[PDB]
Amino acid sequence: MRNFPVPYSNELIYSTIARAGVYQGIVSPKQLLDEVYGNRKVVATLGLPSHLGVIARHLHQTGRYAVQQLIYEHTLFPLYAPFVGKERRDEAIRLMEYQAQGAVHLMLGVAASRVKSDNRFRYCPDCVALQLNRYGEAFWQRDWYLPALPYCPKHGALVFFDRAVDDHRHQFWALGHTELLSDYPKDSLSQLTALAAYIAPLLDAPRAQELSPSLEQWTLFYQRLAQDLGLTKSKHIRHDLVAERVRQTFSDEALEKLDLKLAENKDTCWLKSIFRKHRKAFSYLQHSIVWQALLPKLTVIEALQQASAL
Amino acid sequence: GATRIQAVYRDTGVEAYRDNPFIEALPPLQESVNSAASLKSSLQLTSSDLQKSRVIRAHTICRIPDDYFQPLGTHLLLSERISVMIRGGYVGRNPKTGDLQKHLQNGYERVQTGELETFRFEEARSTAQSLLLIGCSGSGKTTSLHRILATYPQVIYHRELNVEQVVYLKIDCSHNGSLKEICLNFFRALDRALGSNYERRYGLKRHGIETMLALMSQIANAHALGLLVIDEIQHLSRSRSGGSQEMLNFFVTMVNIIGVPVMLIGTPKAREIFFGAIFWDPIQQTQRGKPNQEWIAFTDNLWQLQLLQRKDALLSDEVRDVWYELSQGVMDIVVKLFVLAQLRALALGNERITAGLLRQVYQDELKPVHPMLEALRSGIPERIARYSDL
Amino acid sequence: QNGYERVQTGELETFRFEEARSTAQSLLLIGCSGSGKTTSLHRILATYPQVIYHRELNVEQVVYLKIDCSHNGSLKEICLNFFRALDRALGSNYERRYGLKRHGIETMLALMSQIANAHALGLLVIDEIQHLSRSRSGGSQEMLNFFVTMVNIIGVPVMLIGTPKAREIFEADLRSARRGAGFGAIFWDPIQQTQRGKPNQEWIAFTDN
Amino acid sequence: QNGYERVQTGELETFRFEEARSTAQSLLLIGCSGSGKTTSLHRILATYPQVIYHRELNVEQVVYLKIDCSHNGSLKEICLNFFRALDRALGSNYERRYGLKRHGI
DNA sequence: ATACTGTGGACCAGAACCCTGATAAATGCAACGCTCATAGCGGGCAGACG
DNA sequence: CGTCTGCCCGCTATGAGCGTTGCATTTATCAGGGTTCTGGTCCACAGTAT
């Protein structure tokens, strides 16, 4: 391919490849896969793509784009890197370069959850207008495609529509403004929008690359934090004050929507397992809820600094 | 195939040419001093290479037709017009403030729906213009377009984007008025100036005529093509059923809607099929009752390239008159006749050019072009109507 | 690139980039049949080795090539004699690859331009050009343009050998007569026994030997 | 005449004539294996002579036909058993006429 | 000072995506037939010869 | 007034371009096993009331 578009600011590489297909009139998806990649057995993935390294080679003449830059800034890697650990993070970075989609997903937690959560395409009414006003195009953006939240960080709600990634597994689709929006009222919960605005700065932060505390670091950090809050009995959890605080911070409808509904009667729970010794890396969203319920005076980067220090 | 010149941006002095990477990276607009000194060329004529053998002195004298060029009055106007229509065709195609991304987005629908008037944006206009060049055969339509378009770098590479701007492209029409062989010469000339494979993937997939008319004009916008030149547009006279008008409708939809400038070249036999037009004519000896200054300069600059040992520096009025009489104004005939006379003089051994020698060379070695020159000599419109292309 | 930077910073006032080679030289030899228009060519081009191999490069320079026109007057049977005559000089095959029926005349005219500079071919000789007049494939203006296009593409010098019947094909318009008589037009005549008032010195030298 | 446009359009409910009507009944026979369904059916059907050739008309009235579903259950091997059983009772070449051509279901 | 119970940790297997194999259906492409433009031949039919 | 010399012209053949077609290849579909992930489990550990 003799002319590969540079990704716009804060874009998914899937949209870059789709726009590369648009700019040359390659309607046939097989022809697009042949030209861009060279093999017809690739999967168009949104969030944690593979085969980067032949994408970063098309942009090789542009000095400022390398493999790490696409891995960190134009794929949803910063939402898994701080939590998984060190060796898993390094292995995943090494495997994004090569042609293995399966191994990359296996190394990461919910990437190995083998379910494409809300695989349908999302978009935000107001963001598309701004992008049309400034860039002149409309592209998929990392803010919309949060792992579990169907919500834009700044505006209210993400207006869904039909079609999905898995309907055609070998085709890249690029948004056209002719489907700009449909005017129908939608209101969003305040605390969920607050969570989106709290987790958004983790995407655009250089310090998220090298701050990945280990498992024992996570469990010791949470243990000392719970001791400092004073709700901790001797080697035990109160299991009541924490639930009360998280219920005050986030309502029941929210916990239903993000699929973390509390079961205080059940001994095994997403909140209960954090206090005990950590066995596997928990998702970013559970940690976000814990942080926002316990102490709101520190940002995500400050929390990562405190966790990495000791 | 073509050398990729890395771009460096200058400071243009025009308000409209404000921040375009495409037209702020072209070579600076030259002036009247550089409109008549960046085209001139001549043979070296070293005095050390005049005393050599006959074979060396006869092989080094045949390079005159290829290496000699003298800019006339018309070339200044042609250069200025091409400069204007190649610099003004990018202002409506700004890649910075989202204007080229609005011309490429529309062109995907035309590939999909097959109709070349399905706009998706209405705020993306076109700012290209058109030119038409018509002149007698041998006037210099190609060799004075390969030295006026040769001051531009063709393939440029801008690294702020990833775009590889192709400044100008040249193709020529099919031997008949073919339909799928004008949209294939474009690909065959674009992928030998980039080292790519566009013909093997646009056309080999069994496309229709409409899809190959849309894909051509989409890939001509993926690379910011500045000027498209089509040589010998008279080949569309012998077109297929409807080809003589469908392509001339496309050539007015490309400059008006898609926005790529286009320039057309053809012999006066191509005026029947019809665009600002420029008409070229052979040099006339008399302009206002006195010999033409351009003709005098052309002759007196050609006369200073002579490998004959017994050469005459002074050019006789009789010799000039018989040269014009046997040439009838066409520059190709002028240069070719001079070279042939010089070769025959070297062959005989008499190394001074004479009017009789000129006439003998003409009569013996210009047999096919005889009736056209005689028709132009007679100047009767009835005789001119058949052949001589005037 | 140095020239580009110097002209862009204003140090150098003008600069000339790469240029494109102009039209190939063409010659037309016309002589009555029986005068030796083929024996002369085969005894003049025999002093030049046909295929020369270069060591530092990797090109088998084919110094010349001689093909002949078709009796149909066809135009896809003179673009295919090129491959069939480049197969008897080299060893590789080309009519199998580039000699299909899907490719049109223009495509067969643009694939005999890549293998015309891949091997640095020097001359192209087309013999008996008189056969193209009054052919059923196309009209009289579908080949007078074909020669113009072919001369304008391939770039190797073209020599045409024909009969005085074929003069009327090329004396039709100024374009074709300009290109055909590109490097002079040679016309051959039978030997005359006497010139002016004295016996010829060519007939005597041709007879007494 | 109605059946021709069903072939042309491809939809099996595009009937052209409103006056045309369908007067047919449907039945299914289900019983445990060993009850003797096949041989009883053959004994019942042996009374009708299958291919009766009318004379005033030119139609060869096939009174009845019998086919069996394929083991694969495929969509193309049940519409071919009909053609294979319609020329084993008439002597024609309906299968070569219809089955071999590239046709969709 | 000694039995009762809540809880974390080592630990059996259920199972779900990946791999392998055979079987049926959807294209790409090399080969073949249809259509039009062009040049010419010779037999049959309107004007001049007897 | 018939005919026999030019003129019509109906017709045969030919080649280049375009449309059509059947085979091999690709693509898709489904059954079976498996191996490590995980889902929950039971047991030991430790803190406690009589």
Ligand SMILES: Nc1ncnc2c1ncn2[C@@H]1O[C@H](COP(=O)(O)OP(=O)(O)OP(=O)(O)O)[C@@H](O)[C@H]1O
């Ligand atoms: N102004 C000129 N000064 C000197 N030589 C000239 C000039 N114009 C033309 N020539 C000579 O004429 C030769 C042939 O002319 P050129 O190739 O330009 O013709 P053209 O316009 O392409 O003709 P055609 O009508 O066949 O397309 C060139 O090789 C060149 O040497």
Ligand SMILES: Nc1ncnc2c1ncn2[C@@H]1O[C@H](COP(=O)(O)OP(=O)(O)OP(=O)(O)O)[C@@H](O)[C@H]1O
């Ligand atoms: N009413 C009957 N009187 C006598 N013999 C009978 C009767 N019904 C069945 N049979 C016998 O039982 C057998 C019937 O075999 P057949 O294959 O037709 O039975 P089926 O189980 O109904 O078949 P299918 O394979 O179609 O399910 C034969 O041996 C036949 O003689």
Ligand SMILES: Nc1ncnc2c1ncn2[C@@H]1O[C@H](COP(=O)(O)OP(=O)(O)O)[C@@H](O)[C@H]1O
């Ligand atoms: N200059 C010559 N001297 C002797 N014989 C000649 C000469 N030119 C031609 N011939 C003879 O003429 C014959 C026919 O020549 P040929 O190659 O057929 O030319 P063309 O093809 O033009 O007729 C040859 O056999 C050759 O012997």
Ligand SMILES: [Mg+2]
């Ligand atoms: Mg030209």
Ligand SMILES: [Mg+2]
């Ligand atoms: Mg010969």
Ligand SMILES: [Mg+2]
């Ligand atoms: Mg049965």
Ligand SMILES: [Zn+2]
């Ligand atoms: Zn938004």
